[PDB]
Write a protein that binds this ligand. Structure first.
Ligand code: NA
Ligand code: NA
Length: 206
């Protein structure tokens, strides 16, 4: 499956693609403002994610740091990134279908649209100014808007026991972006797409 990753932001982002225990494609690349990077994701990929990293520095060998989304200091991500990270999430070829969503469960750093480029389903988007509007206690000094689990580490925010409800904090994310997950047990906003669809992830879509 192809994922075209497009940076419409006015600032550089470092795109990242991982399934948690491995890179997807090269795992990460710099995208200047306007640039597009197309990756290939193996069919059957379960639990894949794409995200943006901001304010990154890497040496010649691909080692460095990012202020949001850092994945172990690597340009080419092998693992998931450090919150806050708006997440494009997907599982491909799962009994004949693909499944996509955007999640704010790990916070928000960069607005994103995640849409198919092939027929048969809709895209999803979280493009509101969540950083500018972020509650004081959730603001990350490094940049971005943390989720409450990251800040406060309680069973209720982290849904540790699989029993949790919405919270003041999850409702903020849900209000700004109704079409993304705001906490672990949120009413799903997952889209079912035809098996082997292709996609475009656009940072700063509006
Ligand atoms: Na998923
Ligand atoms: Na999810």
């Amino acid at each position: 499956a192809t994922f075209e990753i497009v940076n419409r932001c006015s600032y550089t982002v470092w795109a990242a693609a991982s399934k948690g225990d491995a890179a997807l494609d090269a795992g990460g690349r710099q995208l200047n403002s306007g640039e597009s990077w197309t990756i290939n994701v193996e069919p059957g990929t379960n639990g894949g994610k794409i995200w943006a990293r901001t304010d990154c520095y890497f040496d010649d060998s691909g080692s460095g740091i990012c202020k949001t989304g850092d994945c172990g200091g690597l340009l080419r991500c092998k693992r998931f990134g450090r919150p806050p990270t708006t997440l494009a999430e997907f599982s491909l070829n799962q009994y004949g279908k693909d499944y996509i969503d955007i999640s704010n469960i790990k916070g928000f750093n960069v607005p994103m649209n995640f849409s198919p480029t092939t027929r048969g389903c809709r895209g999803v988007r979280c493009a509101a100014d969540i950083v500018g509007q972020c509650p004081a206690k959730l603001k990350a000094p490094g940049g971005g808007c943390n989720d409450a689990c990251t800040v406060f580490q309680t069973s209720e925010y982290c849904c540790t026991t699989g029993k949790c409800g919405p919270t003041e904090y999850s409702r903020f994310f849900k209000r700004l972006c109704p079409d993304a997950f705001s906490y672990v047990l949120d009413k799903p906003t997952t889209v079912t797409c035809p098996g082997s669809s292709n996609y475009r992830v656009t940072f700063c879509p509006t």
